[PDB]
């Protein structure tokens, strides 16, 4: 009866998604409504900044993409995908998109500000998380992928850099730049090298099973403190991924090793998440025996770690970046390419 309830919830969440998917919100704010405070992180197309909404006094995180840079890198369709998907989804562990708009130079997406910082920062500083701490995070991602995959979405860029910790110590998944809604197979070589499934590297055509492989890598990295395949050059990492060879640190519990062998399965027809029981093979695994899936979803479990928060607008959980001016050209750049944004 637990399985049937999940199934009904997902049926309704699909209907809500589809109405927004088919009729996307557009142009819901303007730049001059926001005071820009500080840069929170960077990427190849622009940056994410802490901003304050002047009419309400609320703080947000604003993602800014340079249209000319997106075109140069051939990321037009990926950028249109990102916004279209993010405006339509609704889940406790996904960052909420509040406004989007564009001007002559840039695209803008304004999301809830998540003050606890990136999982990456905390993981590097502590070294590694204990198995129960790792388990708490992993559960949230399992439920998030169950939601996403039921909507025909593939996420494709799971890693600690993309996972933000909120005030309550729960995860928010951000950065939907490679997410795609797709019923069959897809072929784009994208993602982060340490996290890529072998079928992506081998140019085979691939599906949602790549997210389950990436979850294997994440769980290993959280519990070990380093990823299962690392080297100084990406080409060297690819060699290791396809080889089929994983070593586990001696402190891994036998249950965790077992989970991991089934997620890091080079053979698609043997990989947990891609068998007939689907996500249930993962949720029913021994390693997750103590996880109350409903309590996690409702956010009722006490988090193992809560970040220090010193009031609204505090950025102490984030690194410092050099600040750059936002230049807005007097001529419209790339109008046709981004007309649907």
């Amino acid at each position: 009866s637990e399985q049937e309830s999940v199934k009904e919830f997902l049926a309704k969440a699909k209907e809500d998604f589809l109405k927004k998917w088919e009729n996307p919100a557009q142009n819901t704010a303007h730049l001059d409504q926001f005071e820009r405070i500080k840069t929170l992180g960077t990427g190849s197309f622009g940056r994410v900044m802490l901003v304050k909404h002047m009419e309400t006094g609320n703080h947000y995180a604003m993602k800014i993409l340079d249209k000319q840079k997106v075109v140069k890198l051939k990321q037009i369709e990926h950028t249109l995908n990102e916004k279209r998907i993010l405006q339509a989804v609704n889940f406790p562990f996904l960052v909420k998109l509040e406004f989007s708009f564009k001007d002559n130079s840039n695209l803008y997406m304004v999301m809830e500000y998540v003050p606890g910082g990136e999982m990456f920062s905390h993981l590097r500083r502590i070294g590694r998380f204990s198995e129960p701490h790792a388990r708490f995070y992993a559960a949230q991602i399992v439920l998030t992928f169950e939601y996403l995959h039921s909507l025909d979405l593939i996420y494709r860029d799971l890693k600690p850099e993309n996972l933000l910790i909120d005030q309550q110590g729960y995860i928010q998944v951000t950065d939907f730049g490679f997410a795609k809604r797709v019923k069959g197979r897809t072929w784009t070589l994208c993602g982060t090298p340490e996290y890529l499934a072998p079928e992506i590297i081998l140019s085979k055509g691939y599906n949602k099973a790549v997210d389950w492989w990436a979850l294997g890598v994440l769980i290993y990295e959280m519990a070990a403190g380093y990823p299962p395949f690392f080297a100084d050059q990406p080409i060297q990492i690819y060699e290791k991924i396809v080889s089929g060879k994983v070593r586990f640190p001696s402190h891994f519990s036998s249950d965790l090793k077992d989970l991991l062998r089934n997620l890091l399965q080079v053979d698609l027809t043997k990989r947990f998440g891609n068998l007939k029981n689907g996500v249930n093979d993962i949720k029913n695994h021994k390693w997750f025996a103590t996880t109350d899936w409903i309590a996690i979803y409702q956010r009722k479990v006490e988090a193992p770690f809560i970040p220090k928060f010193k009031g609204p607008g505090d950025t102490s959980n984030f690194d410092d970046y050099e600040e750059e001016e936002i230049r807005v050209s007097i001529n419209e750049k790339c109008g046709k390419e981004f007309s649907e944004f």
Partner: peptide, 20 residues
């Protein structure tokens, strides 16, 4: 140790996505 090998490696910082 593997941990020491990792910490001395070129990839302990934030990792960029690939597009190409």
């Amino acid at each position: 140790t593997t941990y020491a090998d990792f910490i001395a490696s070129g990839r302990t910082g934030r990792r960029n996505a690939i597009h190409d």
